[PDB]
Amino acid sequence: EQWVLNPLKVKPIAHAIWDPHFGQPAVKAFTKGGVSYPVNIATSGVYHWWYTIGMRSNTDLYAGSLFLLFLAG
Amino acid sequence: MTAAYLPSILVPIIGLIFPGLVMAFAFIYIEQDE
């Protein structure tokens, strides 16, 4: 939702990092993306694809995740 | 993050308990004869 507001400036987040081997410099170094936790920045382009096909909010990305869990079942 | 507790709860379980348990069971299954 932060990225869709400003897609050329915000760096897309793939998922967060919870790694008990990290030092505090590592935790600070990965805390980009405008959030308060370490993150991987997505290189998959899924933000640009989901933006282009209609998805606007987290609720509809989540609704898509739920629908795919149903389809997987 | 919402449900921020879940990464602390699951990542050690999925990353240590899951392999340990499935390796232990896989070891038992590959070694067993009947």
């Binding site: 987290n58 609720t59 989540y62 995740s65 149903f70 079942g73 | 919402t2 449900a3 879940l6």
Partner: peptide, 30 residues
Amino acid sequence: MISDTQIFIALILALVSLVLAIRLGRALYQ
């Protein structure tokens, strides 16, 4: 943002998918 309840619904549906995955794997294994 996603609620903890919404995450729990996703975890319920993924558990149902896990059970169906176990059932397919046992059926394929025979």
